[PDB]
């Protein structure tokens, strides 16, 4: 089986700036006239769409900027003004001998100016403490980079238990994170207590940013 | 045009056979390969059938497991995986002639698990309290254990969009999934604009309108 070897495995990159990712196969994959090596982009949630077959070859719809290069063994494809809606995964595939064969992949991520996340919090609804269950949720939306930590505090003390994190991805248009925590006590413990606050720890600030409420 | 089967839920062990109907050229004529995707994860070759003959030729990974078949009568292939497992969840693709291009069916989801269906509990989110005066309030609802995805949500019966996220589900150690779906709002309008989230789960035909109100303290 021909191995194809993608690297690098993630780029991050500012709009506007170029970049080039390398695929090699374990041999030549020249023949006829032609080098049976295409590139394709899988954006979250979609299926792969051709931009090059060939090794240079440019789908029709496909804009100039991506341009794909090399034969034998060494290809690249190259993405001039880079933008967020970029933002996907690349595979090159060999199509000489079978079985066909992707590339692990090239998850191009893009760079921009740091935000702040915007927290809200929300209490338990009504109709969760009808039954036996109060969560607690907070959404720390539109932010960068994508590290980010978020704490949650019971009457002044953390509660690291029965806690559930999500993060959206890159956004398509700004590039941003999102990301929602959700703490899940009994009825009971929420009862109990009175202070709940997430505090969100991410580089744009010195100091957690900090939401809060009192039952 | 390539127009897959709907989507497939299954019990680990038990099989799943995926419909491919083609039109808009000759079908015995090009090899018709299927490629999976995972959710969040790459594309993945499986096989191909030439539709002429019916010879084929699977990846390592699923020979003796999955089984290409063609009905040249009505242009329509097929694959068949046994022996499913939660790790065949994805979405699955024909594509034609994938080595020289081209054509993919808009793929069919399946979904491998010892969970049943399941329609989501709807909880709100309350209006985020806030200590000082004015500023930007989020709201939700929390769409929490269904069974299987997917879940579509809009607000006010699609008439607020501005502001709106509803994030991907995750799956929970329960074997089902819950999501949220978000809106940032002004403050100054929680007093007089009312919100529903609209949550519809087709795969067990539950439909739920939440409104979405300020706590009583507020």
């Known amino acids: 089986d021909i191995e194809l070897t993608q690297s690098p495995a993630s780029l991050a990159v500012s709009l506007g700036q170029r970049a080039t990712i390398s695929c090699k196969a374990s041999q030549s994959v020249d023949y006829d006239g032609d080098s049976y090596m295409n590139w394709y982009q899988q954006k979250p949630g979609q299926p792969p769409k051709l931009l090059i077959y060939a090794a240079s070859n440019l789908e029709s719809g496909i804009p100039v900027r991506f341009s794909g290069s090399g034969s034998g063994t060494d290809f690249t494809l190259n993405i001039h003004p880079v933008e967020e809606e970029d933002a996907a995964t690349y595979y090159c595939?060999?199509?000489?001998?079978?079985?066909?064969?992707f590339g692990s992949g090239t998850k191009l991520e893009i760079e921009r100016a740091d935000a702040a996340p915007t927290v809200s919090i929300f209490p338990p609804s009504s109709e969760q403490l009808t039954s036996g269950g109060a969560s607690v949720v907070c959404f720390l939306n539109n932010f960068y980079p994508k590290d980010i930590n978020v704490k949650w505090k019971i009457d002044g003390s953390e509660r690291q238990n029965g806690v559930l994190n999500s993060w959206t991805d890159q956004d398509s248009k700004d590039s941003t994170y999102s990301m929602s925590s959700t703490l899940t006590l009994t009825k009971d413990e929420y009862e109990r207590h009175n202070s709940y606050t997430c505090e969100a720890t991410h580089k744009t600030s010195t100091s957690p940013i900090v939401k809060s409420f009192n039952r | 045009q390539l127009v897959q089967s709907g989507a497939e839920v299954k019990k680990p062990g038990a099989t799943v056979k995926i419909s491919c109907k083609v039109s808009?050229?000759?079908?015995?004529?090009?090899?018709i390969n299927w490629m999976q995707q995972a959710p969040g994860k790459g594309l993945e070759w499986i096989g191909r059938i030439y539709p002429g003959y019916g010879n084929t030729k699977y990846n390592d990974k699923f020979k003796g497991r999955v089984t290409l078949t063609a009905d040249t009568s009505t242009d329509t292939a097929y694959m068949e995986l046994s022996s499913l497992r939660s790790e065949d969840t994805a979405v699955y693709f024909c594509a034609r002639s994938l080595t020289f291009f081209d054509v993919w069916g808009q793929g069919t989801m399946v979904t491998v698990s010892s969970a049943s269906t399941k329609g989501p509990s709807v909880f709100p989110l309350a209006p985020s309290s806030k200590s000082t005066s004015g500023g930007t309030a989020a709201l939700g609802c929390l769409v929490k254990d269904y069974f299987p995805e997917p879940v579509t949500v809009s607000w006010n019966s699609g008439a607020l969009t501005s502001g709106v996220h509803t994030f991907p589900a995750v799956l929970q150690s329960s074997g089902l999934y819950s999501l949220s779906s978000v809106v940032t709002v002004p403050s100054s309008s929680l007093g007089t604009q009312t919100y529903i989230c609209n949550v519809n789960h087709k795969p067990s035909n539950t439909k739920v309108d939440k409104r979405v109100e300020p706590k009583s303290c507020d």
């Open positions: 595939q060999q199509s000489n001998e079978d079985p066909f064969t």
């Open positions: 808009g050229y000759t079908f015995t004529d090009y090899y």
